Design a protein around this nucleic acid. Structure first.
Ligand SMILES: [Mg+2]
Lengths: 131, 415, 295, 34, 51
DNA sequence: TAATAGATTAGAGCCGTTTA
RNA sequence: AAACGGCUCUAAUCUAUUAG
């Protein structure tokens, strides 16, 4: 019989300097490290894709439950956890109405033109790809 | 009277008080944290009066270095002691020490006697300790709050210091043939003959045929090998190369260990032909799986090795590869081979993958252990070994009992 | 096949943090398998899903979800098959206790078809780039350059590393291998070996269980039986205890996901992701070198 | 030439921060000395 | 002379909104004329400056 | 150049969502 | 491509040897 040594599970620090092991519990307890004031979401997709993203963004705000909450922690809600606003009413939307190259080019050129020409600042562009 | 009152240092000790306050309301406890509940306009000290004296169930001090010398918190604490004397309830005050820069001998004499709940370096564990104290003192939605309460309790779940024992997947080589022999079949062995079709394991290396078998065994398929002089063959002690002290210009140590590994694998492949077990191809190597109906109730030693799933049949199968890095050992790998009706394999591989994933979805450690151990014990000949025919007089022994492991740290198995 | 990585590579020139979301992920209930349950059955994982996406968003909007808790640069380099492209990620601690978790980009190209090893010039370039990044960040050269990879280090590239490095720096090379067939079971209970166990095979090589059962979750990070990762200190001098501690620490920073831990160090995984993104499209000079543009 | 390198200092500082640094910046306030 | 224009031009390829502020603007009081009142007397327009 | 192994390595796909 | 895993398939390389 060979002995199995133990490496202690490391703890990741969080806001207020509180260190925990699971990402989920530390986030839902103390919140993230740095405060960003919000997420100005940009959405590049069809109108149906924008509607789907908006509905999911509304659903994120309220708590959403796993089937086994002990095995996998719940989501309290985006504002509860991260302390910043990621509302679906502040979305910068860019509608879309070698095949891989031009399919990438569509979303790409949309994003470059939005980031260059448009005044609306976007924190992160949510490319809602169709199916 | 049901209300938990939190006193703290207002100017510079707000974050902890706020977090604790909303945590306590999220747990169902009524709180009067001042920076969150002190109404604007009202006479603040008279409201503190009314809250502490009339309806405060328990009084909490935040005992940071900022506190314990500030006039507001000291007044609040002194009136808390007055309420303690009036109520005659033990530990009506529950001091909370967050700052680590003050010792227990610098805490003010007003609360130094009473035990402060540890908040120095873990707010969540200290909060769970506070919750346990509140439960002990019976301090007074039914599905939403229990998740947070159990998360507070569970955030610090660690491995308990208990002995745990484990069955591995490796199976050790008990013993090896004494001599690895290079026969000089310069012309007796046909050049274009395929030595993998030889009855016994043997491989063509450096105008030699190296194997664990006697030079006279390859006769039925190699008639010309007869009347071969035994002095031409060169024999090496197996343990000599396994320990690595053998090193010779004729054959390097690592290469000789590689050929022994190949011999072990080849011998396993030949043996499993005899062991009454069918075969299946992976992209890497062979899998040995038993037919349905060729085992009693599909069961060997109280372990079911084949069964049914969605009008298909699944069979437990193994794939063995010998290695000599840690010790002379043979690493097994467990797989599920799917057939249409128990006798005929399913040709397409995609359904094989899908059915294997579906079958292993609900299988876990105990199931895999029972199936692997039962399969190895089924292919075994004697009680504690399995035979590999590398020679008419030499065999390879693989132990039935895997390399057992043990550890000082483990857990309680959830019920 | 190459939608995501090529898209990220094309936006890579002008730094724009982007997150790709499939329609079947956000609203998985509507699109079905045409005969029953939805194609991506996310009912049991919805909140977890809502976790990861949110965390990903919070990372791509400039927010730091969590840190680690000195003087050691963790340099995970991964080889991409195209010629071979070595792309690295680096992780260390600054003087303000923050964890600098950039990449190490500007991929170095081995012309050989199957040699997953850096040529001496490219090895020197990679190591001096990482050391210069650490020097400009922490004002001083690292005490230990924990270089880990999925391949064994050859002699010439290790000599290049040791000659380009300066004095008072002991760089240690580690090889992390997945899917080694050491399936270690548990005889007593019905649950697998719990995460954190390490099997010290030799002084330089061991089997670390970076994933498995976790007491804190009353379940397993890995379905079926966990596969340990083989950790081998083939090059450099270090203790297997500290190396396994470092690997277990690095298995926490998967900002791309909200999961308790991943089976492999996050440095290797992030380096692999950025390398795939780089090799997806044409060459980019001085790429952004920050993970929000890749993951 | 002094203008070019003086601009280059602030420039490459901004580009490295926007490229390498994780923390997002909405607008960069170049505090030019006098 | 051409610091502002060149700096704004060189950041055009990698679009980064930038605002150039002089130390004599944000803190105008600290820089006198060695003889008296500061170079850039913003006292009457401090609110407007902030605006 | 082909082949026969063993050791490393690397890609892609594919299914399940971690036993209460 | 929310993600992490387990498995499946496939390819290449480095060795050692043999036939080209
Ligand atoms: Mg992602």
């Amino acid at each position: 019989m060979k002995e199995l040594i133990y490496i202690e599970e490391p703890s990741i620090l969080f806001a207020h300097g509180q260190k925990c092991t699971d990402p989920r519990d530390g986030l839902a307890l103390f919140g993230p490290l740095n405060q960003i004031y919000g997420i100005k979401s940009g959405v590049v997709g069809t109108q149906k894709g924008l509607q789907i993203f908006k509905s999911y963004l509304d659903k994120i705000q309220k708590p959403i439950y796993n089937h086994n909450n002990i095995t996998r922690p719940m989501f309290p809600g985006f504002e509860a956890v991260f302390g910043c606003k990621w509302e679906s009413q502040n979305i910068v939307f860019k509608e879309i109405t070698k095949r891989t190259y031009d399919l990438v080019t569509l979303f790409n050129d949309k994003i470059i033109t939005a980031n260059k020409n448009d005044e609306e600042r976007v924190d992160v562009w949510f490319v809602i790809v169709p199916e | 009277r049901n209300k938990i009152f939190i006193s703290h240092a207002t100017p510079e000790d707000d974050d902890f008080t706020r977090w604790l306050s909303l945590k306590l309301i999220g747990l169902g406890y009524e709180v009067w944290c001042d920076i969150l509940f002190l109404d604007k306009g009202v006479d603040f000290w008279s409201t503190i009066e009314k809250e502490i004296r009339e309806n405060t169930c328990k009084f909490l001090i935040v005992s940071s270095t900022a506190g314990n010398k500030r006039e507001g918190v000291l007044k609040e604490l002194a009136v808390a002691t007055k309420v303690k004397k009036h109520l005659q309830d033990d530990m009506f005050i529950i001091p909370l020490a967050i700052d680590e820069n003050l010792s227990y001998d610098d805490i003010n004499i007003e609360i130094v006697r009473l035990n402060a709940i540890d908040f120095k370096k873990s707010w969540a564990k200290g909060l769970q300790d506070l919750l346990d104290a509140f439960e002990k003192q019976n301090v007074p939605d039914h599905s939403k709050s229990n998740l947070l309460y159990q998360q507070i309790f569970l955030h610090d779940k660690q491995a308990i210091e208990k002995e745990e024992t484990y069955d591995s997947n490796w199976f050790p080589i008990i013993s090896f043939p004494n001599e690895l022999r290079f026969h000089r079949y310069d012309w007796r062995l046909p050049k274009q003959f395929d030595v993998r079709t030889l009855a016994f394991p043997a491989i063509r290396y450096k105008e030699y045929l190296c194997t664990f078998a006697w030079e006279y065994d390859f006769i039925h398929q190699l008639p010309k090998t007869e009347t071969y002089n035994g002095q031409e063959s060169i024999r090496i002690s197996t343990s000599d190369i396994l320990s690595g002290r053998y090193d010779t210009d004729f054959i390097r140590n690592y290469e000789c260990q590689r050929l022994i590994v190949q011999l072990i694998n080849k011998a396993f492949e030949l043996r499993m032909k005899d062991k009454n077990v069918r075969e299946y191809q992976m992209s890497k190597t062979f899998a040995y799986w038993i037919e349905k109906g060729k085992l009693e109730k599909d069961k060997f030693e109280k372990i079911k090795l084949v069964g049914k799933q969605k009008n298909k049949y699944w069979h437990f199968g193994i794939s063995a590869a010998g290695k000599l890095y840690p010790s002379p050992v043979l690493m097994v790998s467990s797989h599920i081979i799917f057939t249409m009706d128990g006798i005929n394999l399913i040709k397409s591989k995609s359904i094989q993958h899908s059915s294997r994933r579906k079958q292993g979805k609900n299988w876990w450690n105990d199931k895999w252990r029972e199936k692997l151990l039962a399969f190895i014990r089924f292919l075994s000949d004697d009680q504690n070994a399995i035979y590999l025919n590398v020679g008419s007089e030499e065999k390879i022994l693989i132990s039935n009992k895997p390399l057992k492991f043990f550890g000082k740290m483990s857990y309680v198995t959830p019920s | 096949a190459q939608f995501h990585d090529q898209l990220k590579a094309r936006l890579l020139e002008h730094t724009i943090p982007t997150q790709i979301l499939r329609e079947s992920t956000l609203a998985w209930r509507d699109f079905k398998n045409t005969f029953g349950a939805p194609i991506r059955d996310f009912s049991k994982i919805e909140g977890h899903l809502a976790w990861t996406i949110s965390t990903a968003a919070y990372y791509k909007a400039g927010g730091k979800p969590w840190k680690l808790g000195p003087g050691v640069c963790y340099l995970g380099l991964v080889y991409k098959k195209i010629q071979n492209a070595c792309c690295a990620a680096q992780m260390f601690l600054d003087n303000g206790d923050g964890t600098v978790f950039k990449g190490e980009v500007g991929p170095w190209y081995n012309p050989e078809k199957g040699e997953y090893h850096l040529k001496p010039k490219e090895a020197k370039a990679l190591l001096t780039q990482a050391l210069e990044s650490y020097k400009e960040q922490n004002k001083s050269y690292p005490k230990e350059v924990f270089i880990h990879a999925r391949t064994r280090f050859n002699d010439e590239e290790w000599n290049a590393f040791n000659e380009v490095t300066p004095k008072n720096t002991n760089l240690v090379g580690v090889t992390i291998t997945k899917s080694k067939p050491l399936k270690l079971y548990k005889t007593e209970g019905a649950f697998p070996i719990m995460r954190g166990n390490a099997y010290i095979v030799d002084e330089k090589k061991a089997f670390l269980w970076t994933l498995g059962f976790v007491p804190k979750l009353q379940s397993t990070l890995s379905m079926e039986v966990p596969n340990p990762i083989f950790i081998e200190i083939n090059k450099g001098e270090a203790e297997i205890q500290q190396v396994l501690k470092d690997i277990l620490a690095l298995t926490k920073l998967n900002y791309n996901a909200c999961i308790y831990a991943d089976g492999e160090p996050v440095t290797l995984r992030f380096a692999n992701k950025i390398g795939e993104i780089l090799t997806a499209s044409t060459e980019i000079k001085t790429p952004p070198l920050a993970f929000k543009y890749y993951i």
